[PDB]
Amino acid sequence: KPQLQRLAADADVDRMCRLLEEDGAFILKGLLPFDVVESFNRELDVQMAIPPPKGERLLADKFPPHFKYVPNVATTCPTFRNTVLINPVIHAICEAYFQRTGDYWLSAAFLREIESGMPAQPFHRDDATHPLMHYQPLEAPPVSLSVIFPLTEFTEENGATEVILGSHRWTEVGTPERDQAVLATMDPGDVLIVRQRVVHAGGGNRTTAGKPRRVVLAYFNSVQLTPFETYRTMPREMVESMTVLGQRMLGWRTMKPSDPNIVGINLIDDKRLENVLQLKAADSPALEVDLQGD
Amino acid sequence: KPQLQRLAADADVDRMCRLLEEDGAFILKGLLPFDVVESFNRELDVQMAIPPPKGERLLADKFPPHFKYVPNVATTCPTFRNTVLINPVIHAICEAYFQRTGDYWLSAAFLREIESGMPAQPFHRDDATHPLMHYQPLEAPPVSLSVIFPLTEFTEENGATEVILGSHRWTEVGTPERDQAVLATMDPGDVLIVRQRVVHAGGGNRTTAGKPRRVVLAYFNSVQLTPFETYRTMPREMVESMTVLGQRMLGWRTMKPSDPNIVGINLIDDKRLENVLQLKAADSP
Ligand SMILES: O=C(O)CCC(=O)C(=O)O
Ligand SMILES: [Cl-]
Ligand SMILES: [Co+2]
Ligand SMILES: [Co+2]
Ligand SMILES: [Fe+2]
């Protein structure tokens, strides 16, 4: 079977965009160096070690207590917020992918851990958080991109993501056979990029030695789509320590859907949100050198 | 020609919903009493009295200077924020209309004032703010509702909204004639309700001398769609003074698109936004 293509970080962006259109998915090999990955895993370990709260938890309360989940990792994991989330290759791909849609931002990024002995997910499309996506025709400009970070090894045995190449062109998911899919076997620091409507499934984890498979799932959506996670409660000091791009990803700035929206979105007082908030950013001084950068 | 149906404010919501699916629009007679209209007009006069600003204006700068415009009137006009925005008839309609898509909220509510001698808009559908709406099939759950508040009288001369009934079923706008439309002639306190995909046009204002025509346009959208105006800079005191319904409309609470979304949207820390913020509300201890 034709396999997922693995591309280095300096690969051609037009090529990556065409892989998304033809295959529906590809892998960035070794995008994140091992020390970034392990610093991220460490930050994630701290979050998972927090004791269970007494209050309501919207997703977690629907699952048994062994459910392993860290929501909105950008607020508790500085490595994701300051390094992974603003990676320039990821954003080069997003800008090409979202060219017909306009601006994009982060809808969600969260950890899942899949224990030994777990079965494989059913094949599905990622059209449930924003159900209107189910009715978008294939020809419409895409409004969502799934970006998948393996934080342990993904192998055939521990449940590497199953992707059915070309399936974004299918009318319905139906009930595909597992052998129609190819495996996104990867090393931590690789990244899997999956186009909207592509049929896929988590592979579960069929190892028996008790080693979980860890994954962070990020959804970059058209700014027309409401973020699943709202980063509005971040403290100002944390927000201002981010770059402009990171503030844009986390909903703190006015954004621009494609024409025929000629104005923008996420604004107030007919002004940009960042101006009403007088928001500073870490790389403002580099983006405005001679004071005439408009 | 069939005209826009005028309904008493206490008409049956099943009748309103049927008019939206057959005609695509209808008028509510005297929904807002005179004191509400007058209170609202007072508050909008204070905003109109603000001098032209010294900086960028994202919307207004795209248009000629005879553009009169007050953005996000919920943050400056208490009568809209705590009375009009939470009108139980509007919301009865919204709940019925959005039943297939789930929760809705306020994408924008703003004032426009149309001067004498202004030409009509071309016929259009309101699918420009969220361009993805252009590609949704007719049969898909609607994600947007237009709610139009005349704040002066709407007459044939001063540019009452032109609405083409049943045109939500057209595959495209085409090149329709003005006589295919009917006029939303109204008195202050009435409300015009327009379904997604309905071809319509602002009438401009072809009076020759007279007070400008004044209208507040409110867009209620599925909570799946990012609000055009963000109300997140409202003071905590102002937010907590509102009802739960008001806070939900202005984006301060976790909301719920229809299944298969089984968790919600606009949340954080796997908790409701209002619980993370410890938000009080007027009608909620
Ligand atoms: O990565 C996996 O194992 C499943 C990923 C997935 O289902 C998704 O990104 O929607
Ligand atoms: Cl703060
Ligand atoms: Co999925
Ligand atoms: Co319009
Ligand atoms: Fe004619």
Concatenating the DSSP letter of every residue in B45-79 gives HHHHTSPPPSS--TTGGGS-TT-EEE--GGGT-HH
Q: How far apart are CA B242 and CA B282, in angstroms?
A: 5
d(CA A203, CA A194): 15
Test mutation, A133, A144, A232, chain B, max B CBs within 10 A: A232
* A232/chain B closest Cα distance in angstroms: 8
Q: Are A255 and A215 in contact (CB under 8 A)?
A: no
Q: A120, exposed or middle or buried, with CB in 10 Å at 0-12, 13-18, 19+?
A: middle
Distance CA B127, CA B225 (A): 12
Q: Is A217 in the pocket of ligand 1 (CB under 6 A)?
A: yes
Method by which the coordinates were obtained: X-ray
SS (H, E, C) chain A: CCCCCEECCCCCHHHHHHHHHHCCEEEECCCCCHHHHHHHHHHHHHHHCCCCCCCCCCCHHHCCCCCCEECCHHHCCHHHHHHHCCCHHHHHHHHHHCCCCECEEEEEEEEEEECCCECCCCCECCCCCCHHHHHCCCCCCCCEEEEEEECCCECCCCCCCEECCCHHHCCCCCCCCHHHCEECCECECEEEEEECCCCEECCCECCCCCCCEEEEEEEEEECCECCCECCCCCCHHHHHCCCHHHHHHCCCCCECECCCCCCCECEECCEEHHHHCCCCCCCHHHHCCCCCCC
The tally of CA atoms less than 13 A away on the side-chain side of residue A29 is 8
Q: Which two tokens stand for residue B249?
A: 């409309």
**For B83, which DSSP code?**
I
| Helix B13-22 with B88-97: angle, nearest 10 deg | 50
The partner residues of B195 in beta bridges, in order of sequence, read B145
Burial bucket for residue A178 (CB in 10 Å: 0-12, 13-18, 19+): exposed
Report the alpha-carbon distance of residue A149 to residue A37 in Å, rounded: 9
Sequence length of chain A is 294
Among A44, A3, A57, which Cα is nearest to A27's? A3
Say if residues A60 and A67 touch (Cβ distance below 8 Å).
yes
* Domain A6-287 belongs in CATH node 3.30.420.300: no
Report whether the peptide linkage leading into residue B150 is cis, meaning its omega lies within 30 degrees of zero.
no
Helix (H, G, I), strand (E, B) or coil at B285: coil
Nearest to B164, CA basis, from B151, B176, B149: B176
Whole-angstrom Cα distance, residue A7 to residue A269? Answer: 44
Residue B161 near residue B216 (C-beta atoms within 8 A): no
The minimum CA-CA distance between A2 and chain B, rounded to whole Å, is: 32
Ligand 1 neighbour A111 (Cβ under 6 A): no
Helix, strand, or coil (residue B128): coil
Task: Give the tokens for residue B247.
Answer: 């806070």
Residue bearing the CA closest to ligand 1, atom 3:
A202
Probe ligand 1: pick from A114, A115, A118, A121, max atoms within 8 Å of CB? A121
Task: Report in angstroms the alpha-carbon separations of B140 from A128, B136, B143, B261.
Answer: 15, 6, 9, 16
Take atom 2 of ligand 1 and give the residue whose Cα is closest.
A202
Which ligand 1 atom sits closest to the C-alpha of A126? 10
A34 CB-contact burial (10 Å; exposed 0-12 / middle 13-18 / buried 19+): exposed
CA gap B103, B253 in Å, rounded: 11
Does A161 sit in the ligand 1 pocket, CB within 6 Å?
yes
The continuous run of DSSP H or E covering B105 comes out as strand B104-114
* Resolution limit, Å: 2.0
Q: Letter for the amino acid at A189?
A: G
- What is Dmax (Cα atoms) for chain B? 58
Residue A25 in contact with ligand 1 by CB distance below 6 A: no
CB burial string B205-239: b at 16+ within 10 A, e below: bebeeeebbbbbbbbbbbbbbbbbbbbbebeeeeb
Q: Do A132 and B136 lie within an 8 Å CB cutoff?
A: yes
Alpha-carbon gap, residue A256 to A95, rounded angstroms:
13
Cα gap A106→A126, rounded to integer Å: 15
* Token pair recorded at residue A223: 């700014």
**Cis before B88? omega within 30:** no
Q: How many CB atoms lie within 10 A of CB A168?
A: 21
Cα(A248)–Cα(A110) distance, integer angstroms = 18
Q: Which atom of ligand 1 is nearest to the CA of A215?
A: 1
Ligand 1: residue whose CA is nearest its atom 5: A202
Question: Contact, B129 vs B219, CB < 8 A?
Answer: yes
Query: What CA–CA distance (Å, rounded) separates B136 from B147?
Result: 21
The token duo for A64 is 């048994």
HSE-CB at B180 with a 13 A cutoff on CA atoms is 14
Q: How far is CA A48 from CA A62, A73, A154, in A?
A: 17, 11, 21
**Ligand sitting nearest the alpha carbon of A236:** 2
- Pair A213, A152: CB distance under 8 Å: yes
What distance in Å separates the CA atoms of residue A104 and residue B208, rounded to the nearest whole number? 46
* Nearest partner of B72 among B63, B60, B62, judged by Cα: B60
Amino acid at B47: Q
Residue pair A26/A133 in contact by the 8 Å Cβ criterion: no
Please state the atom number of ligand 1 nearest to the C-alpha of residue A217: 9
Q: Which two tokens stand for residue A14?
A: 């037009």
Q: Tokens representing B104?
A: 């809705």
Give SS3 for B13. Answer: helix
Measured CA to CA, the distance from residue A155 to residue A186 in angstroms comes to 7
Kindly report the number of other CB atoms within 10 A of residue B250's CB atom.
25
Q: Which of A114, A115, A146, A157 to mutate for ligand 1's pocket (most ligand atoms within 8 Å of CB)? A: A146
Structure tokens at B118: 């202004």
Name the residue among A55, A101, A226 with its Cβ closest to that of B226.
A226
Q: Which residues of A touch B109 (CB under 8 A)?
A: none
What's the farthest any 2 CA atoms get from each other in chain A?
62
Give the C-alpha separation, B140 to B47, whole Å: 39
CB under 5 Å of ion ligand 4: residues: B 126
Pick the closest to residue A230 from A193, A276, A266 (CA basis).
A266
Residue pair A206/A158 in contact (Cβ under 8 Å)? The answer is yes
Structure tokens at A233: 């409660």
> Which of A283, A276, A273 lies closest to A245, judged by CA?
A283
Put the strands of the sheet holding B182-183 in their side by side order: B182-183, B162-163, B200-201
Q: What size, in residues, is chain B?
A: 285
Whole-angstrom distance, CA of residue A21 vs CA of residue A14: 11
Residue B159 backbone dihedrals phi, psi, to 5 degrees: 100, 40
Q: Residue type at B160?
A: A
Q: What is the CATH number of domain B6-277?
A: 2.60.120.620
Report which residue type is found at A131: P
Distance CA(B131)–CA(B183), nearest Å, equals 27
The span from the CA of B76 to the CA of B31, in Å, is 22
